[PDB]
UniProtKB/Swiss-Prot annotation, chain D:
Protein's organism: Thalassiosira pseudonana
Whole sequence portion shown: 308 to 381 of 752
Protein name stated in the entry: Photosystem I P700 chlorophyll a apoprotein A1
Subunit structure: The PsaA/B heterodimer binds the P700 chlorophyll special pair and subsequent electron acceptors. PSI consists of a core antenna complex that captures photons, and an electron transfer chain that converts photonic excitation into a charge separation. The eukaryotic PSI reaction center is composed of at least 11 subunits.
Taxonomic superkingdom: Eukaryota
Transmembrane domains' residue ranges: 42-65
Task of the protein: PsaA and PsaB bind P700, the primary electron donor of photosystem I (PSI), as well as the electron acceptors A0, A1 and FX. PSI is a plastocyanin/cytochrome c6-ferredoxin oxidoreductase, converting photonic excitation into a charge separation, which transfers an electron from the donor P700 chlorophyll pair to the spectroscopically characterized acceptors A0, A1, FX, FA and FB in turn. Oxidized P700 is reduced on the lumenal side of the thylakoid membrane by plastocyanin or cytochrome c6.
Similarity remark: Belongs to the PsaA/PsaB family.
Location of the protein in the cell: Plastid, Chloroplast thylakoid membrane
Curated annotation (Swiss-Prot), chain F:
Stated name of the protein: Photosystem I reaction center subunit XI
Positions of transmembrane segments: 47-67, 72-92, 121-141
Keyword Transport: no
Family to which this protein belongs: Belongs to the PsaL family.
Disulfide bonds: none
PANTHER family named in the record: PHOTOSYSTEM I REACTION CENTER SUBUNIT XI, CHLOROPLASTIC (PTHR34803:SF2)
Lineage, uppermost ranks: Eukaryota, Sar, Stramenopiles, Ochrophyta, Bacillariophyta
UniProt cross-references to SUPFAM superfamilies, sorted A to Z: Photosystem I reaction center subunit XI, PsaL
Keywords: Chloroplast, Membrane, Photosynthesis, Photosystem I, Plastid, Thylakoid, Transmembrane, Transmembrane helix
Pfam family, one: PsaL
The gene coding this protein: psaL
GO biological process: photosynthesis
Keyword ATP-binding among UniProt keywords: no
GO cellular component: chloroplast thylakoid membrane; photosystem I reaction center
Primary location: plastid
Length: 217, 170, 164, 74, 170, 146
């Protein structure tokens, strides 16, 4: 009606998306972040909300607010890293690899598709949860600091480079490297889906296919 | 333009109720008015006929014919053709009076007009309005009846047929 | 001009909505009739919706809950005396409404005469009025949908949110 | 429920704000001014508290006979 | 006339136009365009979409030989009537189809949300993989006109097709 | 928005313009009631009021009176209603005498002796007749069944 539409504020009509020529370009995907092909059909990057409020209630204190892209990038990176890790583990477990010095519980496991249940029953999953939680809390606080505007860390930057693969490297090269991580991560995320749905419906194997003629569920 | 003055306006406020703007100029209005009147007059007679027949009355030599639209389907076409011939003739006879409201056939060969029925201009307008209104009602009525006949067989919805009280006719 | 003055009814999802342009050449009086009809049809729909929902739910504590839960079956079961009172009563209110309409300053749809205290300058007033209209518009469509379901599909209960 | 009102950590509700916001077309300024009254008048507080306490006692009487709460009481 | 949208301007004839010329030039008897100028863009987009879908529907109807498709469930031999397929594979294939159609359609909302303010040409989703659209505007418009004309034909075509079957052995 | 304002814009009168007191509905209903309607003569005002009040009074007596279950219950109810109407009529007569006096002049002002007397007379006729109408109606009740 009369009120000015937020469409104007959440999209740049002058320019247009690259992956999607028809759609206009989201005003936030300006290319600063790596891997930006201007792809946000749902214009989620343009949503105005400090998602950092999840970690710390906004009412607690006045903060500048973490830009949406920062939060979104964080999640994308995290999801990707986790997915890549999971994929490797699934296959290795399928190959039979078990912990060095492990015992019957691990050895007996029939297939990765069945490991979760047996492990949760064993209780080891609980142990992992507590450990993972510690990591989450120890590393998450940084986001609040960034939103507060008191720190200038970038998304995914945990200053973690033991082997110095990227130490003293041309910025352009660091860029391609980080993109490589993102690309591999995105691939892994999609990969896990089949590694799950297919296995559930069909059976676990190197191809993890489902008996087309036979039932799946 | 403003046809509010024309007879048959819905009411003082709405004026001419033309939802789809069929009428644009006086020329069109005259066309539409003529049609409305013709359909109206025809319908008024139709309702009367349908009721008479459906209730059971039949002319001499028509005691075995069916009633309703069923008649048109079953009764011989040969005995229906007369209707067309008696109607087409009338179509030719009626003569529109120039410079007069649509549907005025005063110029017809046989005497036709307000005659003794109307005196003042107001009386004329009243009779005209009543003719139009009753026609409008019948137009809806004949449809309502036929539709319900097909739907349930009850053309009158609440009763099967009318019973007449004609003392002198007896 | 109605189009140049109307404020209530124009909302965010679609703004002014007249795809078929059924109001382009209409005068103020015709447009007033339309708005009054819109509101009345909508308000009656809202009420009908609530009635159907209650009956379908089974909360019809009248006549010893003898009448059926199916709203359409119940109507047939209701004695005519009940229906006559309904029509006549509504007719009475209609007469009074006509009196109010004739009075100078009538705003189409206002039977409480809220014009005496508030005008459309107040945004709160226009907004609340919009809510009535919007909910009424939705209700109109709903009552038409529900009847279809009961008469053709064969159900008179929610087939959308029932599956928790 | 005890974590609904603000104290010293930002999060929470301020009763004054809640009361003042609730005003309508038929009630003028609404519930404005009530907070000060109930935070500066013991008599006002006692009124509400005493009425509610008495009302509770009456409820206890009804609910404690229909639903006997103790062994060998009924 | 719209706002310059390619269309109409057709020698194509039509003797059943109740109101207006029998030609297809500027075919807008109802007159929705002038009454609702702001909806012209939307109407164009909807027209194109309906037509394009119809053009695919006809060929989909003309391939009831189960050709290029395996699977007993999909066997056109098993499901002789192409029409029966909708209910035949409703929960096995129709749902799948919906998934992709739905995802694709939702992604276009950004453009359609404010068509008037945005500059995208109605119906132009930048899809010319073979890069073969007459570069010349003169013919470019002609090409567009062909699409519209063929699409309009298709829309009507499908109706007859399907219905026809509803009244024949197929 | 305030739906309650001082009446007649007088902040000091003992009355308020609430939706109930001053709404189109209330105004319309009260304007057309026989008591305040414009044009009605004193007699007609009384008649309408009487016709209305007599019809609903026969009910209570007929269905809950001492002889309700008797075959002559409706007749008894009618008689009882007539008795009540007489009592009310006495009241009207007495009120007029005290409030208006003995000789009047204005005329056609419900608030004068002559007008009041005419009003009272109308009430009596209307009330008694209305009660009779109810007797005839309640004698045979329609089931409105087809
Ligand atoms: C990062 C993986 C990893 C690696 C490299 C090793 C490496 C080793 N393990 Mg080991 N282990 C692991 C995970 C791992 N473990 C886990 C997750 C468990 C839980 C069951 C165990 C339980 C385990 C036992 C019970 C024993 C080992 C032993 C050994 C030995 C060698 C140093 C043996 C040893 O003597 O350790 C020094 C031995 O007896 N491991
Ligand atoms: C993440 C979502 C997802 C889901 C739900 C599935 C689901 C499925 N995939 Mg699949 N797949 C995925 C991601 C996914 N896959 C990814 C990321 C790849 C990498 C290319 C594949 C590659 C793949 C192959 C190569 C095949 C499947 C097949 C299948 C089906 C067996 C099953 C329905 C099989 C199929 O076609 O069945 C429909 C099959 O042959 N998938
Ligand atoms: C629907 C068309 C139709 C048909 C098929 C008939 C058929 C018949 N009519 Mg008939 N009739 C009709 C319409 C029709 N009528 C109408 C509309 C009227 C009203 C004017 C009459 C008035 C009428 C009279 C007054 C008489 C007939 C008679 C007859 C019979 C002989 C016809 C006649 O006069 O001598 C050839 C014959 C069974 C005659 C009859 O049966 O003799 C007793 C007869 O006397 N009809
Ligand atoms: C098509 C049917 C028809 C026929 C055959 C006649 C035939 C006749 N009419 Mg006429 N008339 C008709 C329709 C018809 N009229 C209509 C529809 C009207 C109303 C407008 C009139 C109004 C009318 C009047 C006012 C008069 C006649 C008169 C006459 C007679 C001279 C003549 C017998 C005249 C007559 O002789 O009356 C006794 C006469 O004064 N008619
Ligand atoms: C003037 C006061 C008044 C009185 C005395 C009644 C009395 C009655 N109404 Mg009623 N009614 C009234 C006003 C009144 N209504 C109004 C103002 C409305 C709204 C317009 C209705 C709408 C209404 C409905 C819809 C129904 C009744 C029904 C009934 C009857 C109850 C069932 C029955 O017959 O048991 C003895 C009873 C005779 C019910 C009835 O007659 O059904 C049997 C019924 O269904 N009334
Ligand atoms: C505004 C939304 C809305 C509306 C109009 C309705 C309307 C209705 N629901 Mg429903 N429902 C809704 C939301 C809604 N529901 C939601 C969100 C849920 C999930 C909790 C349900 C769960 C639900 C159940 C489980 C049942 C209904 C039933 C009903 C019908 C009986 C009315 C009643 O008293 O309900 C109560 C009525 C048509 C009942 C029904 O269909 O009766 C036949 C019924 O059994 N509803
Ligand atoms: C989805 C259905 C659809 C829609 C939205 C349109 C939309 C349009 N058509 Mg169209 N058309 C259609 C189906 C449709 N067509 C079919 C099936 C045929 C073949 C019979 C045609 C034949 C046709 C011709 C010959 C012309 C148009 C023209 C137009 C444009 C202006 C006409 C107008 O007022 O809009 C119509 C608005 C609608 C909402 C469509 C009405 C749908 C229902 C009945 C209402 C407009 C973009 C004109 C044009 O392009 O001029 C520039 C023109 O000359 N159409
Ligand atoms: C009425 C005229 C004919 C009456 C008749 O023939 O009696 C014949 C009938 C006799 O009806 C009697 O009814 C009794 C009770 O049921 C008995 O049981 C018998 O049915 C019967 O013998 O009289 C009537 O009951 C009908 C008369 C009703 C009068 C209508 C009310 C008019 C206003 C009355 C108030 C008058 C006071 C001032 C008026 C202003
Ligand atoms: C009772 C219906 C009801 O709650 O209406 C409530 C009605 C409207 O209240 P408002 O929404 O305008 O005011 C809101 C504030 O009071 C906070 O709720 O207030 C009254 O005017 C009551 C009138 C006396 C009550 C008449 C007896
Ligand atoms: C609740 C309500 C309402 C109301 C209701 C009511 C209150 C009713 C009442 C009613 C009434 C209360 C009525 C009455 C009636 C009456 C009548 C109807 C009467 C009649 C009479 C007559 C007709 C006559 C008589 C006579 C005379 C006058 C004398 C001589 C003799 C004779 C008999 C002739 C309404 C619905 C609105 C709405 C809602 C609310
Ligand atoms: C509407 C209205 C109103 C209201 C009212 C009300 C709400 C209530 C009322 C109520 C009432 C007002 C009641 C009454 C009652 C009465 C009674 C209950 C009585 C009874 C009586 C009797 C029982 C008697 C008997 C007898 C006779 C008749 C004769 C002689 C002998 C003896 C004495 C035995 C007002 C006023 C505001 C205003 C106007 C309108």
């Amino acid at each position: 009606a009369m009120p000015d539409r937020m469409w104007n504020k959440m999209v740049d009509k002058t320019q247009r998306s690259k992956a999607m020529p028809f759609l206009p370009r989201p005003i936030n995907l300006d290319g600063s972040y790596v891997g930006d092909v201007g792809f946000d059909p749902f214009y989620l990057s343009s949503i105005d909300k400090n998602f950092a409020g999840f970690i710390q209630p906004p009412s607690w204190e006045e903060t500048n607010g973490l830009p949406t892209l920062y939060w979104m990038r964080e999640a994308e990176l995290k999801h990707g890293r986790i997915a890549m890790m999971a994929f490797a583990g699934w296959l290795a477990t399928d190959f039979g690899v078990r912990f060095p010095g492990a015992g019957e519980p691990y050895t007996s496991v029939p297939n990765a598709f069945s490991a979760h249940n047996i492990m949760v029953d064993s209780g080891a999953m609980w142990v992992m949860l507590s450990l993972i939680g510690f990591i989450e809390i120890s590393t998450a606080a940084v986001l609040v600091e960034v939103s507060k505007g008191e720190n200038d860390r970038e998304a995914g930057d945990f200053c973690f480079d033991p082997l110095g693969f990227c130490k003293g490297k041309s910025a352009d090269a660091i860029n391609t490297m980080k993109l490589k991580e993102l690309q591999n991560g995105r691939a892994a995320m999609m990969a896990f889906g089949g590694l799950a749905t297919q296995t559930a419906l069909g059976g676990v194997d190197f191809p993890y296919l489902v008996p087309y003629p036979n039932v799946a569920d | 333009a403003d046809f509010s003055g024309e007879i048959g306006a819905a009411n003082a406020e709405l004026g001419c109720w033309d939802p789809l703007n069929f009428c644009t100029d006086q020329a069109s209005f005259d066309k539409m008015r003529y049609a409305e009147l013709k359909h109206g007059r025809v319908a008024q007679l139709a309702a009367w006929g349908y009721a008479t027949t459906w209730s059971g009355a039949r002319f001499p030599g028509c005691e075995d014919f069916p009633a309703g639209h069923e008649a048109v389907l079953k009764i011989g076409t040969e005995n229906l053709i007369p209707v067309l011939v008696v109607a087409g003739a009338l179509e030719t006879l009626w003569k529109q009076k120039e410079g007069s409201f649509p549907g005025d056939f005063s110029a017809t060969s046989f005497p036709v007009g307000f005659g003794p029925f109307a005196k003042t201009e107001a009386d004329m307008i009243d009779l005209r309005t009543k003719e139009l209104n009753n026609g409008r009602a019948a137009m809806m009525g004949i449809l309502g009846m036929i539709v319900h006949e097909q739907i349930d067989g009850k053309p009158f919805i609440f009763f099967d047929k009318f019973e007449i009280y004609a003392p002198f006719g007896n | 001009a109605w189009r140049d003055e109307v404020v209530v009814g124009i909302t965010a999802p679609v703004g002014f909505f007249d795809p078929l342009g059924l109001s382009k050449g209409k005068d103020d009086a015709t447009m007033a009739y339309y708005r009054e009809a819109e509101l009345k049809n909508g308000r009656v729909a809202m009420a009908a919706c609530l009635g159907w929902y209650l009956n379908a739910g089974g909360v019809h504590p009248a006549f010893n809950s003898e009448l059926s839960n199916d709203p359409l079956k119940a109507m047939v079961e209701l004695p005519a005396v009940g229906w006559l009172q309904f029509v006549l009563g509504c007719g009475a209110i209609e007469w009074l409404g006509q009196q109010i309409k004739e009075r100078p300053g009538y705003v189409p749809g206002d039977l409480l005469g809220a014009s005496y205290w508030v005008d459309n300058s107040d945004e709160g007033w226009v907004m609340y009025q919009n809510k009535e209209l919007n909910n009424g518009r939705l209700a109109m469509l709903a009552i038409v949908g529900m009847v279809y379901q009961d008469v053709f599909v064969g159900d008179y209960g929610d087939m959308m949110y029932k599956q928790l | 429920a005890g974590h609904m009102y603000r104290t010293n950590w930002g999060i929470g509700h301020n009763m004054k704000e809640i009361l003042e916001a609730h005003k309508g077309p038929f009630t003028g300024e609404g519930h404005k001014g009530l907070y000060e009254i109930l935070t500066t008048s013991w008599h006002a507080q006692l009124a509400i508290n005493l009425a509610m306490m008495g009302s509770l006692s009456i409820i206890v009487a009804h609910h404690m006979y229909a639903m006997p709460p103790y062994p060998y009481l009924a | 006339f719209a706002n310059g949208l390619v269309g109409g301007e057709g020698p194509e004839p039509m003797p059943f136009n109740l109101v207006g010329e029998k030609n297809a030039k500027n075919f807008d008897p109802a007159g929705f365009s002038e009454r609702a100028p702001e909806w012209i863009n939307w109407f164009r987009e909807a027209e194109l979409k309906h037509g394009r879908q119809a053009m695919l529907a006809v060929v989909g109807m003309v391939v009831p030989e189960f050709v290029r498709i395996p699977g007993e469930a999909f066997s056109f031999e098993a499901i002789p009537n192409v029409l029966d397929a909708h209910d035949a594979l409703l929960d096995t294939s129709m749902k799948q189809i919906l998934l992709w159609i739905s995802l694709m359609e939702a992604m276009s909302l950004g453009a359609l949300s404010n068509m008037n303010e945005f500059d995208r040409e109605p119906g132009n989703f930048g899809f010319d993989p073979l890069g073969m659209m007459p570069k010349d505007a003169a013919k470019a418009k002609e090409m567009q006109l062909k699409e519209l004309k063929n699409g309009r034909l298709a829309m009507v075509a499908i109706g007859g097709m399907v219905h026809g079957a509803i009244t024949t052995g197929h | 928005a305030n739906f309650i304002k001082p009446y007649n814009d007088d902040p000091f009168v003992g009355h308020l313009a609430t939706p109930i007191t001053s709404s189109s509905l209330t105004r319309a209903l009260l304007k057309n009631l026989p008591a305040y309607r414009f044009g009605l003569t004193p007699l007609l005002r009384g008649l309408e009021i009487g016709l209305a009040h007599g019809y609903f009074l026969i009910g209570p007596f007929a269905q809950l009176g001492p002889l309700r279950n008797s075959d002559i219950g409706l007749l008894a109810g009618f008689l009882s209603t007539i008795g009540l109407i007489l009592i009310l009529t006495l009241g009207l007569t007495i009120y007029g005498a005290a409030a208006f006096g003995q000789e009047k002049s204005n005329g056609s002002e419900l608030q004068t002796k002559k007008s009041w007397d005419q009003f009272k007379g109308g009430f009596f006729v209307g009330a008694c007749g209305s009660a009779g109408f109810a007797f005839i109606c309640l004698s045979s009740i329609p089931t409105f069944a087809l």
